[PDB]
């Protein structure tokens, strides 16, 4: 709730103040003058724990708040940027974008709501990716994972596209970086997901609703298989056994979709007369068939398995 942070008028006032401070920093920098980001940092209210929901977290409920984030990062140092990431991960369940992108809390999102989710995904996740790829050590990445696991219902976060993608980024970065602390932290994360891994795949009624609003012929689930690939890759054999068991029905459902597309391709390609529209139809079927093969193989190959010629076998 917006009232748990000071209300709509207070947060909108904070955003306007943030913009004023960024415009001043940008003007000073452009004119080749000295810059002091103290006023801008203070206008963000990150160290402010006066409210049930931090004012920075509520600012992220608005497009204006989201859109200024890369520009904010141009004027901050490493520890300030890390404090922002720590705040985001600490209050991730209170983030409106998580509630909007979760099929559990928002089973029927409007087109406007879907656009907000795509915006947060494009801007915020690109910032997190760049920062962790360049300015983060083992302790700091481990710290962010612990912030996520200790302050949130991790299973609820996985019902959200943003939540799932944020976890994939942390896991993938941790995997690139001893073995020991990461094995322990991966296991704590695995505990919060165990018996609930199937819940990362949204219901069919949810997919239908999104597909109808976006004019999608197929639901894009590449991010789910990317998460499963990163979870499997950092896991021991026992973790992999559990993952495969929990998503077995989803593996077979994807194979069925790919096989239905292969049949459609065969039926349409044998037609003698082929207009530009039928060629568009065939190219669309082949693209979506190969997409399902590739997304599933991203997950399978990691465990030394492969889906080829209608069967899963050893790689």
């Amino acid at each position: 709730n917006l009232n748990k942070s000071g209300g709509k008028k207070f947060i909108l006032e904070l955003i306007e103040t943030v913009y004023e401070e960024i415009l001043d920093l940008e003007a000073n920098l452009r004119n080749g003058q000295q810059t002091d980001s103290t006023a801008m940092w203070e206008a963000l209210h990150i160290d402010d724990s006066s409210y049930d929901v931090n004012p920075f977290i509520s600012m992220l409920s608005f497009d204006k708040g989201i859109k200024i984030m890369p520009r904010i990062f141009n004027f901050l140092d490493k520890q300030q940027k890390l404090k922002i990431l720590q705040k985001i991960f600490n209050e991730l369940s209170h983030l409106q974008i998580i509630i909007l992108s979760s099929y559990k809390t928002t089973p029927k999102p409007t087109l406007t709501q879907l656009k907000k989710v795509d915006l947060f995904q494009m801007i915020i996740l690109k910032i997190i990716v760049s920062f962790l790829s360049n300015n983060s050590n083992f302790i700091e990445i481990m710290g962010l994972l612990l912030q996520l696991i200790r302050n949130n219902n991790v299973s609820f976060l996985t019902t959200s596209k943003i939540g799932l993608n944020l976890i994939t980024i942390l896991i993938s970065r941790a995997a690139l970086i001893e073995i020991s602390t990461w094995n322990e932290i991966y296991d704590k994360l695995f505990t919060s997901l165990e018996s609930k891994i199937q819940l990362i795949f949204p219901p069919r009624e949810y997919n239908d609703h999104i597909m109808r609003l976006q004019n999608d012929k197929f639901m894009d689930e590449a991010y789910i298989w990317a998460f499963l690939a990163s979870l499997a890759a950092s896991g021991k054999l026992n973790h992999q056994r559990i993952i495969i068991d929990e998503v077995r029905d989803e593996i077979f459902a994807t194979i069925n979709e790919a096989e239905t597309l292969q049949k459609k391709e065969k039926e349409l390609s044998v037609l003698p007369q082929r207009s530009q529209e039928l060629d568009t139809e065939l190219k669309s079927i082949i693209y979506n068939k190969e997409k399902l093969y590739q997304d599933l193989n991203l997950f399978l190959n990691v465990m030394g398995l492969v889906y080829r010629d209608g069967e899963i076998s050893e790689l």
Binding site: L237, Q240, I244, D245, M303, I312, L315
Partner: peptide, 14 residues
Amino acid sequence: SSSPGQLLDILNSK
């Protein structure tokens, strides 16, 4: 390291 052996079987078994 031999993960494909058992994993392929668990994917069918249950």
